[PDB]
Write a protein that binds this DNA or RNA. Structure first.
Ligand SMILES: [Mg+2]
Ligand SMILES: [Mg+2]
Length: 1240
RNA sequence: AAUUUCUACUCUUGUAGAUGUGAUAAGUGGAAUGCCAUG
DNA sequence: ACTCCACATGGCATTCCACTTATCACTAAAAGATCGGAAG
DNA sequence: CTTCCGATCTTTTAGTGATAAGTGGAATGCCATGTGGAGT
């Protein structure tokens, strides 16, 4: 009988606690006068300068390695094709093996162990790779093998400024070893080549060959654009899109050339662009030819490749010049404005714009491409000018319409024909517009310039002037000056003169926009090192004089002590432990042996002495260094750890590959005995009570043995020190004493502590000291942030503050990773039938909506989480989102919205977790594609689709409730672990512990009472005869004489060509045009039943705004206008389709589409209800405006309710699942059939 | 209207909830401006 | 107190911003470089 | 006047089994369409 309290101590999690350090006593004088802060600031600055200098070596080596790659890519393409054909486990394993094989084949060039290279080149690559992650980068032991980097004297000084400090780059070495490795890291060069870029290139090749097979002219078009751009002159376009061409496109230059082939080289702005592959395909589609209809079915976009991991991008496009400071942009703009003033732009522009009143307008022309701008700016709509032109061309006349459209689409038009088509109103609006634009330009030129671009007003005035100048340039670009059509000579010459004068303003606008929108400078913290190469990397007492980090405890206040280097040497400061009743500090005594898996072979088998001993003779060697008794290394022990092959004989890989269970068991037992002897004999571990360990032959696998052994090697004890010694040490300057501090260590605190304060207090509590459940970690780091009753706004930023980031580890007694975590949760849900569901719907109108259901589908609690603790967070997020949108267009400080969303979700996660604990339920979420949620966050960044799964999963991974006692599960020492260990979103399955993912579709627009959905898809009824065929497919519809509602019948075996392909459980439906009378809810508000909300499509091409519709009222109005009698209750459908008028059939289809729309939304009045087009067997049509608590209230509440029921389906199928596994997704047919069978 | 830091506050020199840091790399999405086209 | 109206989209290019996603470390001790004093 | 070497400070190192990712596509929906401005 498993229990809900059993979900604890399953896996380790690592957390970082952050505290402010208060300098205690005279330590601030000693840390300031020795210049540690300034030296560490200079060290950080030199590191930031030196990082790209070092990166040049890695980029050069990666280039020189990747130009030598010569592989055959047919096997990987075949593997991907076979995986895409059928998604099964065996083909997935084959694809994983092939990807690993190619990732190793790429990695062999970096190592220098490939057959297809010479021995000298391989030796050079091996000797380059050997010193690539060491101090050989600094002292030139590997730089002279390359030579191409060509470091100058300042770069050499920067490189040698880190003398005896190379281990500062240790984390950089770990970061850069991920790149040159083939261990399936996403941030690796071979993984990027094999798994990221190659599927994109294969899809591009398949797209190209399909496109060429469909139409032959696109081959000539692609050859012409490839010749015109100027890339790959030796390879044809049939050879570029081929598998052997992927031996290139590995270095960044070839990738950028391929991307410029796809996208197109761009010249300077104001000059015609050379099109790309995607651009010319979009141009061919937009022509609306028959070939466009051919292409539209095909997938018509080539996918560009990704950047290489280190090499920077370069392009053939016009990289436009940038300014460097506010002084330069103001001085350059003042010079440009002065130049425009003495050249006298404005009087000759006004002469041009008043010359139209006394000139023959037949010798002037308007550019064809910009007539839409004039139409939008001058008249009520963009279509008015071209509609007038079309009517005028008709008035002076099948094929003639095409001739008129072809004349209007590409040939310039004179202004006299414009003035004949439109009349006096366009003339007066035109001169008014030029007068307004010239007035704006004159006002901009007379207005002085601000000095600096610091505050918003000084940037807004600059934008106001420069946009007016751009508007005058746009107005001046209206006229056509080219010789292809007739034009007055002197006017054209002077017009191109003033346009040539005005040309650089458009580039000036872009330069000022690129400068003015930069992020403002803000002071940031930097890592302190106290002139120590390895400061605070470990708390151990053996390393306490080299690391310097020692913790203390003083009557509940926690202190940190740093002993600096004295005259450049490590003075081993020692403390004498005294009697416990003496007043003073309690020193923390750390005892650790970091990991048995890495430290048993290092201190036993991988010594230089042992390896040198075993390459001449097989006699066992006795080791005496750091051993109380001489330990013996035998021959078979050394060959167990060095088997001259990748799998070792005592590990699970050998047993899986070979199957020799007996040999694996013998090797494992020998290794356990050897580790026991080693831990018995080593001085560091000779006092460890190893009697609690199991015998050697009982362990199933070595990882279990290490997971059991590791908690025994960690220990903390506290020793008393006299206060006089510590005070003398901190006064003399031999010790820097800081107090670990936050809000909860203040004088007057009353309430419950912070969660991290609970972690810190529970780490050093006596019960955790007796048995370690929370582990204090190394690699602590110190940061210094400078300067950026008496209650003061932003008091914390008024002075410099020392920070202290310290990692901790929770659930230390557990394993590193859980052992089949989902099996335990599935077993617990299998043995517990009555388990609720806390299903969640995410959106933007309602940010989070939840519904809690029981096992029988009833509603326990439904509630919108737009407001928590009397704060409507959705309105605040909407205001912030609108402020950011309006601020990024006025060149303001955009700011951050992540903080407010995190604040809102901190409340939401607490409410959801509180319901989880109080109901002992599961949480079902909707499985949304990353593209969809990124698109919806792009449209409105108020939304919380992302940043909600991550916080919920990370909270449930280590859930500590503040109220609960520490010894009880759920306390600070026994956290709840209700989710699987979070590694990455890609590797997450459909179930993560108690959190469930169900498919998204058919959860909102579904009737909760009977499970009806709209069966049609409205894209297939675009034409009138299809509307006739859709109309004759229905059985009947007639007016009920006693209830006043039209009852339309449906049989599901009809209109299969218009259905979306989901036959429901029911064979028939009763679609009802309900009587539009007044109904009252529980609160007494009136509403009209059957009301629908539909956007207006009166223009037949655009989506207008919403309007209220009444299907019964408009239906009876249509039928009374037609005069068709219906009071006898007879079927009207054959009486209706007997006429050939398109208006009646069109409004019939419109009414049917409107009545079948379940979701009715109107953001202006705040209405999100659902009305049901069909009738329940109880004789009540559903309407959520009744607001009965047994049924959902809004549409998002309905969405949450059907997320809950979709997870109810999974839990219902779990009870009959003998394999303790869930379904492999839920098909929409299965879900609809299940819900419609449950309702009926 | 105080906070390691974020969010909502002020019976309380503080309250309630949350908070994995550092480093590196990549991608996505907005906005402005150009070019070719579409309604 | 009513009613009309606000140009929109597709493919690329440049710059700027914000935000997300995916790896590594959470480390004592063995090995190697350096140096001040002893010995020749 | 020159050479060695034991102390001491940086620097590099050692490396387990999680076994996962369970598939089901063939297309849908998953959510919403600027909401706010003006004259008369
Ligand atoms: Mg939903
Ligand atoms: Mg929803």
């Amino acid at each position: 009988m498993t229990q809900f309290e059993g979900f604890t101590n399953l896996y380790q999690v690592s957390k970082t606690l952050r505290f402010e350090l208060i300098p205690q006593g005279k330590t601030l004088k000693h840390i300031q006068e020795q210049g540690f802060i300034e030296e560490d600031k200079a060290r950080n600055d030199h590191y930031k300068e030196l990082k790209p200098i070092i990166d040049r070596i890695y980029k050069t080596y990666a280039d020189q390695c990747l130009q030598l790659v010569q592989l055959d890519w047919e096997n990987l393409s075949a593997a991907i094709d076979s995986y895409r054909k059928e998604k099964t486990e065996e083909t997935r394993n084959a694809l994983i093996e092939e990807q690993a094989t190619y990732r190793n084949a790429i990695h062999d060039y970096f190592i220098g162990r490939t057959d297809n290279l010479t021995d000298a080149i391989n030796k050079r690559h091996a000797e380059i790779y050997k010193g690539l992650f060491k101090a050989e980068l600094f002292n030139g032991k590997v730089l002279k093998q390359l030579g191409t980097v060509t470091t100058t004297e300042h770069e050499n000084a920067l490189l040698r400024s880190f003398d005896k400090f190379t281990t500062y780059f240790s984390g950089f070495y770990e970061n850069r070893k991920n790149v040159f490795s083939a261990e399936d890291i996403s941030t690796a060069i071979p993984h990027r080549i094999v798994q990221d870029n190659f599927p994109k290139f294969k899809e591009n090749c398949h797209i190209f060959t399909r496109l060429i097979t469909a139409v032959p002219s696109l081959r000539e078009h692609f050859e012409n654009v490839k010749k015109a751009i100027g890339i790959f002159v030796s390879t044809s376009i049939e050879e570029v899109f081929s598998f052997p061409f992927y031996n290139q496109l590995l270095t960044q230059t070839q990738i950028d050339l391929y991307n410029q082939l796809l996208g197109g080289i761009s010249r300077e702005a104001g000059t015609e662009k050379i099109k790309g592959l995607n651009e010319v395909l979009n141009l061919a589609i937009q022509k609306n030819d028959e070939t466009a209809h051919i292409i539209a079915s095909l997938p018509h976009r080539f996918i560009p490749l990704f950047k290489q991991i280190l090499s920077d991008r370069n392009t053939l496009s016009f990289i436009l010049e940038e300014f460097k400071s506010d002084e330069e942009v103001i001085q350059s703009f003042c010079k440009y404005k002065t130049l425009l003033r003495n050249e006298n732009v404005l009087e000759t522009a006004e002469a041009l714009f008043n010359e139209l009143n006394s000139i023959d307008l037949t010798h002037i022309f308007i550019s064809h491409k910009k007539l839409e701008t004039i139409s939008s700016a001058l008249c009520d709509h963009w279509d008015t000018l071209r509609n007038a032109l079309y009517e005028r061309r008709i008035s002076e006349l099948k094929s003639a319409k095409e001739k008129v459209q072809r004349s209007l689409k590409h040939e310039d038009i004179n202004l006299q024909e414009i003035i004949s088509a439109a009349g006096k109103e366009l003339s007066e609006a035109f001169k008014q517009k030029t007068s307004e634009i010239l007035s704006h330009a004159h006002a901009a030129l007379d207005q002085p310039l601000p000095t600096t671009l610091k505050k918003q007003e000084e940037k807004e005035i600059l934008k106001s002037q420069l946009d007016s100048l751009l508007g005058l340039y746009h107005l001046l670009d209206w006229f056509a000056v080219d010789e292809s059509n007739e034009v007055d000579p002197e006017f054209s010459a002077r017009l191109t003169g003033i346009k040539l004068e005005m040309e650089p303003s458009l580039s000036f606008y872009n330069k000022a926009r690129n400068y003015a929108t930069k992020k403002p400078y803000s002071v940031e913290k930097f890592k302190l090192n106290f002139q120590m190469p390895t400061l605070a990397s470990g708390w151990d007492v053996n390393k306490e004089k080299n690391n310097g980090a020692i913790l203390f405890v003083k009557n509940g206040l926690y202190y940190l002590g740093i002993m600096p280097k004295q005259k450049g040497r490590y003075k081993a400061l020692s403390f004498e432990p005294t009697e416990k009743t003496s007043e003073g500090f309690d020193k923390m005594y750390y005892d650790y042996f970091p990991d048995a898996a890495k430290m048993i072979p290092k201190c036993s088998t991988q010594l230089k002495a042992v390896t040198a001993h075993f390459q001449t003779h097989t006699t066992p060697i006795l080791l005496s260094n750091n051993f109380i008794e001489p330990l013996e290394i035998t021959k078979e022990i050394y060959d167990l750890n060095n088997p001259e092959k990748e799998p070792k004989k005592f590990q699970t890989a050998y047993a899986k590959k070979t199957g020799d269970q007996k040999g694996y068991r013998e090797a494992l037992c020998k290794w356990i005995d050897f580790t026991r002897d080693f831990l018995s004999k080593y001085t560091k571990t000779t006092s460890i009570d190893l009697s609690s360990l199991r015998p050697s032959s009982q362990y199933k696998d070595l990882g279990e043995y290490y997971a059991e052994l590791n908690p025994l090697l960690y220990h903390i004890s506290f020793q008393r020190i006299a206060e006089k010694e510590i005070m003398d040490a901190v006064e003399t300057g031999k010790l820097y004493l800081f107090q670990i501090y936050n809000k909860d260590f203040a004088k007057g605190h009353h309430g419950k502590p912070n969660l991290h304060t609970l972690y810190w207090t529970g780490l050093f509590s006596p019960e955790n000291l007796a048995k370690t459940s929370i582990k204090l970690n190394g690699q602590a780091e110190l940061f210094y942030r400078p300067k950026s009753h008496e209650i003061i706004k932003d008091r914390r930023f008024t002075s410099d503050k020392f920070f202290f980031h310290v990692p901790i580890t929770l659930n230390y007694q557990a394993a590193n990773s859980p052992s089949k975590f989902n099996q335990r949760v599935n077993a617990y849900l299998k043995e517990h039938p009555e388990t609720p569901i806390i299903g969640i719907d995410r959106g933007e109108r309602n940010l989070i909506y939840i519904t809690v259901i029981d096992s029988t589908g009833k509603i326990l609690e439904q509630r919108s989480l737009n407001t928590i603790q009397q704060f409507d967070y959705q309105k605040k997020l909407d205001n912030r989102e609108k402020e950011r949108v309006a601020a990024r267009q006025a060149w303001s400080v955009v700011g951050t919205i992540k903080d407010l969303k995190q604040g809102y979700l901190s409340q939401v996660i607490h409410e959801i977790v509180d319901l989880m604990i109080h109901y002992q339920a599961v949480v079902v979420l909707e499985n949304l594609n990353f593209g969809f949620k990124s698109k919806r966050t792009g449209i409105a960044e108020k939304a919380v689709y992302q940043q909600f799964e991550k916080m919920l999963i990370d909270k449930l991974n280590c859930l500590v409730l503040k109220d609960y006692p520490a010894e009880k599960v759920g306390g600070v020492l026994n956290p709840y672990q209700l989710t699987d260990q979070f590694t990455s979103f890609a590797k997450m399955g459909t179930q993560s512990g108690f959190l469930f993912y169900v498919p998204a579709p058919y959860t909102s627009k579904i009737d909760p009472l009977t499970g009806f959905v709209d069966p049609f898809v409205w894209k297939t009824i675009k034409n009138h005869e299809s509307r006739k065929h859709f109309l004759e497919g229905f059985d009947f519809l007639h007016y009920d004489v006693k209830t006043g509602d039209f009852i339309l019948h449906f049989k599901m075996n009809r209109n299969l060509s218009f259905q979306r392909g989901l036959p429901g459980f029911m064979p028939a439906w009763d679609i009802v045009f309900e009587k539009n009378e007044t109904q009252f809810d529980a609160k007494g508000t009136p509403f009209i039943a059957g009301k629908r909300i539909v956007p207006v499509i009166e223009n037949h091409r655009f989506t207008g705004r919403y309007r209220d519709l009444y299907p019964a009222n408009e239906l009876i109005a249509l039928l009374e206008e037609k005069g068709i009698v219906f009071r006898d209750g007879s079927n009207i459908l054959p009486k209706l389709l007997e006429n050939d008028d398109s208006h009646a059939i069109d409004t019939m289809v419109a009414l049917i589409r409107s009545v079948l729309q379940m979701r009715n939304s109107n953001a202006a009045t705040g209405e999100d209800y659902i009305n049901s087009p069909v009738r329940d067997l109880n004789g009540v049509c559903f309407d959520s405006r009744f607001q009965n608590p047994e049924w959902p209230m809004d549409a998002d509440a309905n969405g949450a309710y059907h997320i809950a029921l979709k997870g109810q389906l999974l839990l219902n199928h779990l009870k009959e699942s003998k394999d303790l596994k869930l379904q492999n997704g839920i098909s929409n047919q299965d879900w609809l059939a299940y819900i419609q069978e449950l309702r009926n």
